[PDB]
Amino acid sequence: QFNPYGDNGGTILGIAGEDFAVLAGDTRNITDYSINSRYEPKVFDCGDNIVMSANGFAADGDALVKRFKNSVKWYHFDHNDKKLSINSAARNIQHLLYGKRF
């Protein structure tokens, strides 16, 4: 049967300081026992001083990052160029994820 999912392996790490934050990821992408790439970034600047990583099945990760970058874009269009605050991003991202609950 067709399985719509894979695992591209990949680990990400976020730490918050007093007036900074880091988001780190390895740059390796895998399938089973093979290396697809040694440098395929998975941590992204999304505009508005937000970085994002969606790790696991890389196809799903990319789709989500795209959809969120676009969210930010339309947020600018629909709200007079207002900066999307990190809490507001978080909530938006919950809705993106939950819309695919099934």
């Binding site: 709200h79 007079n80 207002k82 605050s85 978080a90 909530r91």
Partner: protein
């Protein structure tokens, strides 16, 4: 008489122009925007002494930071208010924050476009324009206190002060002279009350005019009668001594 959304030779939409006329027949509503808040006041206009005047709801909350006054065919405003409330609450659901006043207004104006007899928009579910205009007032972090006038055209306008309804021509000129960028909230309240007194077709009291405002710090409050009466017992006295 041919179609709902037809152009006149001068390039105006017949139905949009006639709705604007229905609004001129409406009760007066006045809004004043200051730096201590925005004030909204209305002429109740009971069609009879037997009307329980406070069942007349022409100033309504949209969200804690946004209020609205209407004028014209006020029954048409229900679905606009309902839609504005949903937009504001939904925005908070999706974004964990308050909708911006302009954005809320633009949404109400989007709603207003949706007229046409199965019109090649896509999908126009509404047969005529609304017969009601709205003053939308509120506060937000980016652009402070704000006032908007939203017509059934789908156009909206920001104003320092504005008046709509039957007394609007007279009220607008009065606002033109009286408005300045240093008005306190209390002054603004007196001015609304005053200009309503001038144009009301009765003697302005606390049962046939209603006041309200929004402060950043306390949200949107409709003033209850006793608080209004006091300002009315007070305008009279500022306007006796001069």
């Amino acid at each position: 008489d041919r179609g709902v959304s037809t152009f006149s030779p001068e390039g105006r939409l017949f139905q949009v122009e006639y709705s604007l006329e229905a609004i001129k027949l409406g009760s007066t509503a006045i809004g004043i925007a200051t730096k201590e808040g925005v004030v909204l006041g209305v002429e109740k206009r009971a069609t009879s002494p037997l009307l329980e005047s406070d069942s007349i709801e022409k100033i309504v909350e949209i969200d804690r930071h946004i209020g609205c006054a209407m004028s014209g065919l006020t029954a048409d405003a229900r679905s606009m208010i309902e839609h504005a409330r949903t937009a504001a609450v939904t925005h908070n659901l999706y974004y964990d924050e308050d909708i911006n006043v302009e954005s809320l207004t633009q949404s109400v104006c989007d709603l207003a476009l949706r007229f046409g007899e199965g019109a090649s928009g896509e999908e126009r579910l509404m047969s005529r324009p609304f017969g009601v205009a709205l003053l939308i007032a509120g506060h937000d972090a980016d652009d402070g206190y704000q006032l908007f006038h939203a017509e059934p055209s789908g156009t909206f306008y920001r104003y320092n002060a504005k008046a709509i309804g039957s007394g609007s021509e007279g009220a607008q000129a009065e606002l033109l002279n009286e408005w300045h960028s240093s008005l306190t909230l209390k002054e603004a309240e007196l001015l609304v009350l005053k200009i309503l007194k001038q144009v009301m077709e009765e003697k302005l009291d606390e049962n046939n005019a209603q006041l309200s405002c929004i402060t950043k710090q306390d949200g949107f409050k409709i003033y209850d009668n006793e608080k209004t009466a006091e300002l009315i017992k007070e305008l009279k006295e500022k306007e006796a001594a001069e």
